Design a protein around this nucleic acid. Structure first.
Ligand SMILES: [Ca+2]
Ligand SMILES: [Ca+2]
Ligand SMILES: [Ca+2]
Lengths: 192, 194
DNA sequence: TATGGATCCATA
DNA sequence: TATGGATCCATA
């Protein structure tokens, strides 16, 4: 998978291991490919024709190899029931969270909100969210969160006084297109 | 429909006209009825049994009649902008925003961020978000807006340093339940068909 | 029953 | 055509 850019929203104090985990995250994103077993991410360029669920898999596997916990239950407050984060690297006391978008754009707003809640409540040191470029997004499930559509709100997450916190958005994209490769399955395929 | 609770999240400096705005908003919410044409909102207490689409209708209508502008753009300077606000009133050469939420619960996070963006850029003086109680939510299409699921997030929203700002959440609810009223029809969005 | 999705519908 | 909305899903 290509990384087009990374927008660093918050980067206060010293996290460490930081570059070590940002190097891990990037190496992990780089392993993601299509079809399975290919050496790059080749997508079938059908408008809205590719599901988004399994795209992350190879990235989450590579992180596990590097000692991240996957689908890791978290409960930031007490008055919340727990929910899963895609991967987490425990760097002592607090959590470094990675997320790879599989929800509506509106649900991206909540993920960053929950990350910032984690940071403010002292349970999360850093958070990273991976979003499709608009170009990649055009071939994905209608209205999946995507980098361009969230971009107008970035100022919002720049307004916090957080000692020792890292918040970044990563923009990803397919390496190339090919009308002859398989569609990434959707949950609606064959009745479902 | 009735107003169950008003929860103020941000209150800084001076924003004139809040009690008047809050009254007009209550009056708007009061107009919302079921069955359509009724003088209250009676709901069928079937779990996830009721669609949401028509519920906003009378509220947004009452607001337009009282001078609210509907789908008012967020006039931030950048070319990359959020889309429109449900309704905006001018009070004193100042824009006041109203966001109605029967969307997915996640949609409320965008609505808040949109009104905060307007306030940061000093183009909006304040806003209110209206969304259902948990109690009503139990009878609506799954995973729509509900005040309870927003609560853990109030602490995060309270941290924005904005001079001259007002943001509040109005929790709304049906008037009663009747196991014999019509169900509110559902559309075919998302995973309804398959 | 609770949460974070995945997905398709409407539309100036 | 882009943005806001609505509807069940899978698994905790
Ligand atoms: Ca996730
Ligand atoms: Ca709207
Ligand atoms: Ca709305």
């Amino acid at each position: 998978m290509k990384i087009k850019r990374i927008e660093v929203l918050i980067n206060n104090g010293s996290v460490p291991g930081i570059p070590m985990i940002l190097n891990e995250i990037q190496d992990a994103i780089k392993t993601v490919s299509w079809p399975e077993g290919n050496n790059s991410f080749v997508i079938n360029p059908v408008r809205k024709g590719n599901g988004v669920k399994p795209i992350k898999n190879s990235c989450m596997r590579h992180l596990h190899q590097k000692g991240w916990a996957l689908e890791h239950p978290v409960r930031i407050k007490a008055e919340m029931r727990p929910g899963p984060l895609d991967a987490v690297k425990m760097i002592g006391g607090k959590a470094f969270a990675l997320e790879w978008e599989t929800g509506n754009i509106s649900s991206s707003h909540r993920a960053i909100n929950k990350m910032v809640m984690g940071m403010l409540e002292r349970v999360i040191i850093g958070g990273v969210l991976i979003l499709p470029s608009r170009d990649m997004y055009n071939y994905l499930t209608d209205r999946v969160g995507n980098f361009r559509e969230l971009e107008p709100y970035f100022s919002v997450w720049r307004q916090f006084n957080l000692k020792d916190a890292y918040l970044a958005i990563v923009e990803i994209e397919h390496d190339s297109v090919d009308a002859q490769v398989s569609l990434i399955p959707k949950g609606t395929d064959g009745r479902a």
